[model samples]
Every structure is written in C-alpha cells, then in structure tokens.
Target: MKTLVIAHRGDSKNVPENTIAAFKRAMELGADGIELDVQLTKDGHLVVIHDETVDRTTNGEGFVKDFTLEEIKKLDAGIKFGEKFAGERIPTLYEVFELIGDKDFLVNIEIKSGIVLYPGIEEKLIKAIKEYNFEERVIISSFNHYSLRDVKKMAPHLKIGLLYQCGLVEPWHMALRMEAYSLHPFYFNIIPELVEGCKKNGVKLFPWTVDRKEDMERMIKAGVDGIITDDPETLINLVRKGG
Candidate 1:
C-alpha cells in the first residue's frame, strides 16, 4: 500500500468508538492500522477507552481512574451509541490484542495521561507490549510530551510518535531531537515542507481525524505515510484509488 489507512478510534464513524466491534469492522474494511487510546483503571489495570471519564460514551458517570476494572466493566460502552450495541463493555488492551492476534496489523496507542497523569503507565505499556511481543508493531504516542519522554527513556527500542496539535517550526526537528520514529500532527497542519522535512529527517508522518475526501486527497498528495480517520473505509477506498 502506498499509504496506510489507519482507523482513528477504530471504524468510529460506523460503530461505537474504541470498542472491539469497531476494531473488527476496521479489519474487515481492510484498514492498515488502528489508533486507540489507553488509560489505567483504579486497580492499575490497563484498559482501552478514549475519555478521561466514561460520562460521554458509556452509561457510567465517573472518572475512569476512580473505578476498578471490575467496576468499570459493568458500564455499557455501546448503548449510548445505539440500542443494538447495548452490551458492549470496555475492553482491556490485552483483549484487543487477543482480537488482533498474529494479524498483519499496526497499533497506534495514545497514552491518556493528560488530566490524570497515571504514573507508571509507561512501564505498564512496555510490559504489555513485550508480553505480546508487539514492540515492533506499535507506536507509543501521546500529546503529553513528558509521557513520550518517559516511555522513550525507559524503552529506547520502542518507536515513538510525537503527537503535536498544530504546526511548529519544522516539528520534525523535534522528532529527531527526541529520537521519535514518527510525527502525528493535526491533518490541517500538513503541508509540502512538513512532508519533505519529515522524509528528510527519517520520520514518518501520520495525520489524524481526516474524514473529508478533499482532506484525504490533500494528505495523500502531501505524502503522509498514513491517514488516521474515523471512517477507515473511505480512506481505504481513497488509498486504493491512489489519491
């Protein structure tokens, strides 16, 4: 594939975002990768859910970290999206890896350490990735640069994706400085020079949340390594069309 069509929160446009169902749908649509968020439970278990709280997406109404895994598992993650998806529980990263076992897939995990700053998350992440031997196939990325730095310091062998919101003055320079393997910028921030700079600096560029056809086309034309979108099917179709 010339460009990787990576699903942002896993086929999120069609299914409950971040659920196993969304990931399965992404695979069925022939997506090249899945991007998801990870945060720790009260009991220090690593679970997959995007929000700092379960209030918006699930039937629960509290901070994710305040609940133990057992407590959090009781919430209906999919019911808020639709009645058809009533029983969908929040999945642990292990469960997701189980669903993705030995497949030709890539995982881009955004560590949700922003508001809560779950201490020792990097350690947990490294351990789990090693347990599954997926260190080669995962990108440990976060908006929290401190989180990125800690993960890089602890696991130098793991690939790092620098997640910055908008343009910087040649952000690939920062990636190179941090020894990051890739850059995740907002889709609108991508441009010719950014692509050239990233390519020159030996960094991969994977822009996020690009759902429009025109934006998708712009990204491909600008030479991004991957497109992260809620609608992976559309991005996959565009990639297959070569633009």
Candidate 2:
C-alpha cells in the first residue's frame, strides 16, 4: 500500500500553522490528510490552535481558555510568522469544516484535553463532526486516553487514535484496549518492531514530526501507514520520487 503523507499543522513550514492558509497550502501540496490541534475557548467554542497559551502562536496573551471566541477572533494569528500574513485570524472548527467541504482528505483532530480540561468538548466535537457529515474523514486523537474513551463512549462509530510521546513495550495492545483506530506516536518511538507489530495487529501507525528525508525514507521502509510532517511539500516530493 502507498504510504500517506499527512501535513502537521498544515504546511506549517511555509504558512502560519493552524490557519486556513496553512491547510489550503497543504492540500495544494498533495498532502493526503491534515493534522491539527483543537482547544475549547472560554465561551465553550472550539478553536483550531496548537498551544494552550495564545502567546506562542498569536498576538495575544494568556491561556486559550481565558479568551472568548469573540476575543480570540480579534487577535492576529499569522503575524508572528511573517508580516505578509498579518491579518490571519485563529480559525474555528466550523470554519475549518467549511473550508474542507467535500474534500477527499482526512482530518486528524487532536483534542487538547491533556492540559486544560475542556468539559463537554467531546460532545461538542462529535456534534460538529456529525453536522459536517465528516464521520469517515475525521479521526479524533488525544494524549489523554480517557478523552479518547469518552469519545468512543459518545460516538462509537467515529475513529479514534491514541497519541503519546513515549515508547511502549506493546503499544498496539493499548490501542486495542482503548478500541482506538490508529496509533499516533512521536517518530522516535517507532522502531521496525513497532511498525511490524502494528501491521500484525491491524492497527495503523502514523508518526509525527518526521521532516528529514532520511527519516521519511526509513519510516516508509518500516511500512508506516502515514507520516505527519511540518514540511508536506518535502514529503510529497519524496513520495513522488518513489520512496
């Protein structure tokens, strides 16, 4: 099977991460899917952002939970990267759904429930997914395994992935226990054995932040189902070269 290339936070190397522009660029660059982070705002609205605090990615201060959706909309999300994208606003999940309307690519939504507890976020996320009719195209993932379980409890049909940063002895076993659809692990944790194990157990392995050409090639050789990278263009070119 051909390995899939998933854009990490869109084509984040070129465009502002998590903005509409980044996602559109990823699609243009031939990414099979897009991976993005989602956090609930103070007003209980879901916003697309990677950091718990807006200080890193946007022209704002304080935690994302401290700002209302309206307040978040007022801040510039792109100026930190460059002046050309100065006016880019942090996008809402609904806006992203609209942007991806009728597209054929998958969307891996990482629920940011590991740090700040977004009470009822699972229900809201499921409701939005159903509203957009994106059941098949979406995979909900999180570092908090409990959140993944909650998602499963609420929406049994929705695909969920386990996200972790450390290595495990038999990670696929955990996936089975959680009834997860895939395993999203840090690339460093993915050895050849893990790859083979995932294949043996019928669990998909999609590693994150794989940017180097050699590393990409290694992952492909190990039979990863997909690669999540900030530089989608680079991965697309490598895949085109028959790697």
Candidate 3:
C-alpha cells in the first residue's frame, strides 16, 4: 500500500507551526493529512499550540494554562518563526476545524497532556467534532495514555492513535488495551520487525517528525502506514523517486 504523507505541524518547515497558513501550505503541497498539537486555555477553550509555555512560539511568556482564551488570542504567534510570518496569532481548535471543514485531507489532532490534564478536554474535543460534524475525518492522539483512554470512552467512533516518544513499552499490548486505531511511535523507535508485528495484529503504524532523506527512506522501507514529516516537498519528491 502507498504510504500516506502526514504533514508534521502543518508543513512547519515553511510557515510557523500550527498556524492556519501552515495547514493551507501543507494541503497545497499535496499532503494526505495535517497533524497539530492542542492545549487548553484557562477558560477551558481549546487552542492549537505545541508547548506548555507560549514563549517559544508566541510573543507572550507564560504557561498556556495560566492564560485565558482572550489572552492567548492577543499574542503575536508568528513573529518568533520569522518576520515573513509575522502577525499570525495562535488558532483555536474550532477555527482549525472550520479551516479544514469539508476538505479531503485527514485531520490529526494531538491532545497536549502533561502537567495539567485540562479538565473536560475529551468532552470539549468531542463536542467540537460533533458540532462541526467531522467525526469521520478527525483522529485524536496523545502521549498520555489516560487522556487517550478517556477520549476513546467519550467518542468511540473517533479514530484514536497512541503517541509514544520514549520506548516501545509493549506497543501492541497498549494499543489493544486502549482499543486504539493506530500506534504512533516516535521516528527513532520504528523498525521493520515492529511494522510487521503491528500489521499482523491489524494495527496501523505511523511515526513522527522525520526530516532527513536517509531516515525517510529507511522508514518507507520498513512499511509504515504513514509518516509524519516537516516538509511535504521532500516527502512527495522522495515518493516520486520510489524511495
């Protein structure tokens, strides 16, 4: 089967990560899907962002959990990436849903869960998807198993992926226990044997954040269902070259 090319952070190599512009760029470049990270604001609004502290991606400097939705919206989110992408603000989850609404590309939403669990996150995300009627197109993933479990229970129809950055940790077992649709291991953790194993058990395999050409080739050879990458241009060209 042809591997799906999922844009990591929405063609983040070109535009600022997690912005609507980046997502548009990814789709323009012919990516199969766009992956994004999401965190909750102080007032329980879901916002698309990758970090706990907004200092790295936005002009503001504070924990994202400490700020209200209005406060996050006021921050200049694009300047940090480059002047070319200036004036772009952090986007809300609902805004992103609207941006990609009725499109063909799949939407992968990573629920950011670490220190703060973001009370009612599962409910909020499900409600948004139902509100937008994107249950078939939306796939939710997270590093936290608790959150993943909660999401699975809350929305059984939604495709659930378990994200792992550390070790394998009995991947198929965890996926089976959680009833996930796929197992998303970090790029470095993938191997041919793991791919074959996951396939044998009817679980889809996806790895994240691969940028190097050689590593990309290795991943393709291992037979992943999809690869999450920073540059759609590189991935598309590589597939054309039969890499």
Candidate 4:
C-alpha cells in the first residue's frame, strides 16, 4: 500500500500554523491529508489551534479556554510568521469544515484535552463531524487515552487514534487495548518491529513530526501507513520520487 503523506499543522514551515492559509497551502502542495489540533474555547466552541495558550500562534496572550470564540477571532494568527499574512484569524472547527467543503481529503483532529479537561468537548467534536458529514474522513486522536475512550463510547462509528511521545514495550497492544483505528506515535518511537506489529494487528501507523529527508525515507522503508510532517512539500516530493 502507498504510504499516506499527512501535513502536520498544514504547510506549517511556509505558512502560519493552524490558520486557513496553512491548510489551503497544504492542499495545494498535494498533501494526502492534513493534521490539526483542536481546543475548546471559553464559551464551549471548538477552535483549531495547537497550543493551550494563544501566545505562540496568535497575537493574543492567554489560555485558549480562557477566551471566548469571538475574542479569539479578533486576534491575528499570522503576524508572528511574517507581515505578508498579518490579518489571518484563528479558525474555528466549524470554519475549517466549511473551508474543506466536499474535498476528498482526510483530517486527523488531535483533541487538546490532555492539559485542560474541556467538558463536553467530545460531544461538540462529534456534533461538528456530523454537521460536516465527515464520519469516514475524520480521525480523532489525543494524548489523553480517556478522551479517546470517551470519543469511542460516544461515537462508535468515528475512528480513534492514540497519540503518545514515549516508547512502549508493545505499542500495538495498547492500540488493540484501546480499540484504536491507528497509532500516532512520535517519529523516534517507530521501529521495524513496531511497524511489523502494526501491520500484523491491522492497526495503522502514523508517526508525528518527521521532517528530515532521511527520516521520511526511513518511515517509508519501515512501512508506516502515514507520515505527519511540518514540511508537506518535502514529503510530497519524496513520495513523488517513490521513496
């Protein structure tokens, strides 16, 4: 099977991460899919952002949960990157769905529930999925295993993936235990054995933050189901050359 090329936070290396411009750029660069992070705002709306605090990605400073969706919309999300994209606004999950309307693309939505427990986030996320009719196109993942379980329990039809940084003795076992559709481990955690194990167990493997050309080649050789990277253009080119 051909490995999937997933853009981590869109074309984050060139465009502002998590903004619409980034996602559009990823699509333009021919990424098979896009990976994004979602956090619940103060008023219980789901917004697309990687960090809990808006300080890094936006012109605002504070916890994402501390600000209302309207307040977050007022801030510029692209100024930190460069002046050319100064007016980019932080997009909500709903807005992202609209942006991707009718596109035959996959989305890995990493729920940011590990740090602050956003009550009813799973429900809201499922609601958005249904609203967009993206049941098969979206994969919900999280560092919090409990949140993954909650998502599975709440919406059995939705695919769930486990995301973790550390290595495990038998990571595929955890994927099976959690009944996950896929495993999203840190790139360094992927090994030949783990790759074979995932293949045998029918669990998809998608490692995070793999950027280097050598690392991308290694992931392809290891037979990962997908590779998530900040530089989608680089990965796209590598895949084009049949790496």
Q: What is the C-alpha lDDT of each candidate?
A: 0.90, 0.91, 0.87, 0.90
Q: How far is candidate 3 from the true structure (C-alpha RMSD, Å)?
A: 1.6
Off by over 4 Å in 3: none
Clash count in backbone of candidate 4 = 0
lDDT of candidate 1 vs native?
0.90
**TM-score per candidate:** 0.97, 0.97, 0.95, 0.97
Deviation (Å) of 183 in candidate 1:
0.6
lDDT of 3 by residue, 130-178 (tens): 9998898878998887888888887889999999888775588778878
Give the winner by lDDT. Answer: 2
Candidate 2 lDDT over residue span 120-200, tens digit each: 999999999999999999999998889889999989999999989987878898898888999999999989888888889
101-204 per-residue lDDT for model 1 (tens digits): 99989999999756687988899999999999898889998988888898999999999998887658788778888999999998878988889988987899
Q: Stretches of candidate 1 above 4 Å error?
A: none
The better-scoring model by lDDT among 3 and 4 is 4
| Candidate no. 2 TM-score | 0.97
Supply candidate 1's per-residue lDDT for 14: 89
> Once all C-alphas are superposed, what RMSD does model 1 give against the true structure?
1.3
